[PDB]
Amino acid sequence: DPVQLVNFLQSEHPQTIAVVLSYLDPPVAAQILGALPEELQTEVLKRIALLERTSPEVVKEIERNLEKKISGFVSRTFSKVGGIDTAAEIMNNLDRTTEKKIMDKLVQENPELADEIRRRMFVFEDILKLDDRSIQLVLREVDTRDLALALKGASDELKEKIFKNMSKRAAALLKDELEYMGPVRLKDVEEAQQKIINIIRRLEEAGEIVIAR
Numbered sequence: 001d002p003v004q005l006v007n008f009l010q011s012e013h014p015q016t017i018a019v020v021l022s023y024l025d026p027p028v029a030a031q032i033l034g035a036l037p038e039e040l041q042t043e044v045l046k047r048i049a050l051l052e053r054t055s056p057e058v059v060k061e062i063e064r065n066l067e068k069k070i071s072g073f074v075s076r077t078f079s080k081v082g083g084i085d086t087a088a089e090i091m092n093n094l095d096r097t098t099e100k101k102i103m104d105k106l107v108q109e110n111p112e113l114a115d116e117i118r119r120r121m122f123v124f125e126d127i128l129k130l131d132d133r134s135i136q137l138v139l140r141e142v143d144t145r146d147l148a149l150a151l152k153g154a155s156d157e158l159k160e161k162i163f164k165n166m167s168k169r170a171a172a173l174l175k176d177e178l179e180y181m182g183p184v185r186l187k188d189v190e191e192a193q194q195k196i197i198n199i200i201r202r203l204e205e206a207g208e209i210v211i212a213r
């Protein structure tokens with residue numbers, strides 16, 4: 001059912017439809033053209049054909065911004081390459097014997113790098129490997145809004161590890177807000193989780209807690 005497309009275009013003038021249809025894959029562009037009112041059809045195609053001779057000023061402006069946005073992505077992504085994030089992602093994907101060997105050597109040789117990589121490897125579910133005191137320390141820094149949102153994207157064992165580390169009442173209160181907030185978007189769960197991730201990272205940066213490995 002493409003139809004919502006047809007109504008969008010139905011009430012436009014031929015040159016605007018020609019401009020709109022030209023940024024599509026031609027089979028899609030044809031399906032839409034075929035469904036447009038019969039009286040508009042021939043003239044839309046004529047305008048599509050003659051579009052590189054008329055050449056609207058809007059087309060160049062669309063390219064001038066398409067160009068800049070793709071350019072900037074390329075510059076932000078590839079001007080510097082590698083780094084601590086890359087290193088962390090690689091270690092998370094290595095076989096356990098290899099990553100223990102690499103981490104073991106870095107604890108001897110360059111201990112602060114090992115720590116940087118350790119912090120950067122941490123991912124939300126790694127809270128399960130934190131000890132109770134560490135979790136308790138993390139909780140007195142995170143607010144209940146941020147925590148509840150973050151757990152809406154969590155497994156039971158994770159939720160349980162949190163519940164065991166708060167007062168018997170505040171656990172029951174937390175369980176309640178999780179039941180009654182409902183619809184939340186992935187984006188909001190991610191940054192809530194990331195807010196917590198940074199707190200865990202800052203606390204280990206200060207030597208307040210240990211991240212297991």
Ligand SMILES: [Ca+2]
Pocket residue numbers: 076077078080081082083
């Ligand atoms: Ca980079």
Ligand SMILES: [Ca+2]
Pocket residue numbers: 115204205206207
């Ligand atoms: Ca440190």
